[PDB]
């Protein structure tokens, strides 16, 4: 379950530690805002990457 976490976009060896500290499990990742992710990662653009990975949706095809 950290194997999962690490292949997530904008997550690297340095911040896998720090993030495993402020969030229970992957599920809770869904639950955070971009700003709350920035602060937890200290990288605003890393936070963009991971937040976008998670919140991007297909639900189109009209």
């Amino acid at each position: 379950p950290q194997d999962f976490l690490l292949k997530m976009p904008g997550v690297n060896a340095k911040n896998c530690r720090s993030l495993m500290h402020h969030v229970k499990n992957i599920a809770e990742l869904a639950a955070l805002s971009q700003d709350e992710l920035t602060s937890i990662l200290g990288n605003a653009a890393n936070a963009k990457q991971l937040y976008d990975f998670i919140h991007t949706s297909f639900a189109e095809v009209v």
Binding site: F4, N25, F53, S57, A59
Partner: protein
């Protein structure tokens, strides 16, 4: 076509990254994952999901449904 071609490329790239995460789970497929993703729409719905909702993805054990619900819900910290 114009750069529908680009939309197709960016789409495949994203999806194939989702597969990198999910196939981490105990032998859960490239196929499993594409279906998963397109049924749920986003990883956000996918993890907000119950072991019940997961099992509704057509194909996929209730076996595969457990393994994945766990990896997603089991906590990062143990000892």
């Amino acid at each position: 076509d114009p750069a529908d071609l680009l939309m197709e490329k960016l789409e495949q790239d994203f999806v194939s990254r989702v597969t990198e995460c999910l196939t981490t789970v105990k032998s859960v497929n490239k196929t499993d994952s594409q279906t998963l993703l397109t049924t749920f729409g986003s990883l956000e719905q996918l993890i907000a999901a119950s072991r019940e909702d997961l099992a509704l993805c057509p194909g996929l054990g209730p076996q595969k449904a457990r393994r994945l619900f766990d990896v997603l819900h089991e906590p990062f910290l143990k000892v």
